[PDB]
Amino acid sequence: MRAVNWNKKEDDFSLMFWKQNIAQFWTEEEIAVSSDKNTWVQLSKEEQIAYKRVLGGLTLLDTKQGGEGMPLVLVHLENLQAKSVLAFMGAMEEVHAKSYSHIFTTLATEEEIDEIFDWVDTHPLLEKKAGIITSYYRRLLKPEVTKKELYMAMVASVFLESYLFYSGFFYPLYLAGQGKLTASGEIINLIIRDESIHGVFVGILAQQIFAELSAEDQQEVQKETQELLMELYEIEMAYTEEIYTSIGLVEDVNRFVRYNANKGLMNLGLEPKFEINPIVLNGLR
Amino acid sequence: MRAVNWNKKEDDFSLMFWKQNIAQFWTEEEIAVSSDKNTWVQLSKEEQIAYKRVLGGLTLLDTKQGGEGMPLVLVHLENLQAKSVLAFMGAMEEVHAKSYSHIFTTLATEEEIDEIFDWVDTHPLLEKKAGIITSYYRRLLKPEVTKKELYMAMVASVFLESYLFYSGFFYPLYLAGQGKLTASGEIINLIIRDESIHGVFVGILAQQIFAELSAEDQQEVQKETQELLMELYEIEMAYTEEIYTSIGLVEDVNRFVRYNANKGLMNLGLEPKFEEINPIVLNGLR
Ligand SMILES: [Mn+2]
Ligand SMILES: [Mn+2]
Ligand SMILES: [Mn+2]
Ligand SMILES: [Mn+2]
């Protein structure tokens, strides 16, 4: 039975990602958010509701990535150095999820917070979206998996990391780009910095597996990947309509979703399928 | 589908362990080990071989705990806050494993290191020991698991964290207690500080699951736990004989293995099954 041996590289990238993950390490106690109250109270009721809802959705996605996506993809890897990186990335998803609770503590009463999480749990689009992704992860709950199954779990993971978060990240970035909720915006920026390298890394692992598949299997997963992309897109467009119609931002968020869907495809070595908002860009500064 | 909500406690302990795991965060770059070369050369060939072999075994156990034990237990937990803690603990196992490579880079040539890892991979007792533990983890590779299966995976994990590491930890502690390889000893002490909390936490989770089982299932897993304890003990005694006979430490290590097996049992809420810590080892823990 093999032990991980870092003195003999298993690939040309795991060590750099290991070091970068650790270089980026942070926790919610580093960013105090109480000063956001002064701009929080300036938001309309509809704006506050949208913000809380998107952060609830982000919390759900990080919960599933740390508790299902990273663990189940990493248990089936043969590359022990890449497994190490994924384990750390999974822990960081739990840091991310806990940081949303830190934001909530400042922006909402205890009763308001539990209402957010009840809304998350009973929400049909969030259930459908998370169910589609986790179906690929739960396919790995068996002793022997195929490379097509592992590849598609990695595709699902890249799509979560590089694409499904972004209908939610839009709004904290959009507000922070205007000087509103900038401390929470700093947290979201730290989260994004992590998700960006998560998506690149899992996409490298996916491309390595893809190269080992037969031509027939390659065709099959290419079709599944394109179909998954567009299945998620239809759900995202329903989600942005539900969240953002009240505040007039639906088409802006949709443009942002498509930009990030293209980045997810590129992380997998695939061509873009869709043809950044300048305020969001200022929030990423 | 539920998202983790830290503003409503799911249990009385996960937040405390979350905070403590983070308070204890470290990486290998924080302890330079080059100064250990001066005492490494004072050791005999047999002492150096023993040290490299036990660190190889430790690396294997951490590799399996980070890559199988924590992930598969955490997947099946319903408590999202406890899942969060286990994910962080699993990442720390990978930090631990990488820290052994950091020690090796100072103490061995590239060829000597590859020899260590070849020895680990082909070693029959390490394969048997790790295979027993990971068999409990690999029972969780299915869509739905029983509480008996989850409980026994947690028992196996506590036995790894609180018991099976210690035939290996003995020697770095013994040497550090004699002023040898003290920088490496500092790393091992950081690892032990983590494993100690890992075993306590998983043991709490196991006790909670146990209390939820039917009486028939409780009787089954109680017997299986005691059998597993003693099956592992027989293997550990073969392992310590193999590693430590050449340096005259077998009975001392065995004394330390039993002390830690009792701690693992206590972490599970169970009575000790074996009859003070060696004073040199104690000085290495200071
Ligand atoms: Mn995350
Ligand atoms: Mn991520
Ligand atoms: Mn460890
Ligand atoms: Mn541990």
Numbering used by the authors:
A (entry chain A): 1 to 275, 279 to 288
B (entry chain B): 1 to 275, 278 to 288
Article passage:
To study metal selectivity and cofactor assembly from a mixed MnII and FeII pool in the presence and absence of O2, in the present study we describe apoprotein crystal soaking experiments, subjecting apo BaR2b to a large excess of both MnII and FeII in aerobic and reducing anoxic conditions (in presence of 30 mM sodium dithionite). Site-specific metal quantification by X-ray anomalous dispersion on WT BaR2b revealed that the two sites of the metal center predominantly bind Mn irrespective of the presence or absence of O2 in the experimental setup. The capability to exclude Fe appears central for a protein requiring a di-Mn cofactor for function. If Mn binds in both positions, neither the wild-type nor the L61G reacts with O2.
Ribonucleotide reductase (RNR) is a key enzyme in all domains of life, utilizing radical chemistry for the synthesis of deoxyribonucleotides by substitution of the 2′ OH-group of a ribose 5′phosphate with a hydrogen. The strictly aerobic class I RNRs are comprised of two homodimeric subunits: a large catalytic subunit R1, where ribonucleotide reduction takes place, and a small radical-generating subunit R2. R2a proteins utilize an oxygen-activated di-ferrous metal site to generate a stable FeIII/FeIII-tyrosyl radical (Y·) cofactor, whereas R2b proteins generate a MnIII/MnIII-Y·. R2c proteins generate a MnIV/FeIII cofactor and the recently discovered class R2d—a MnIV/MnIII cofactor. These dimetal centers reside in a ferritin-like scaffold, and are coordinated by two histidine residues and four carboxylate ligands.
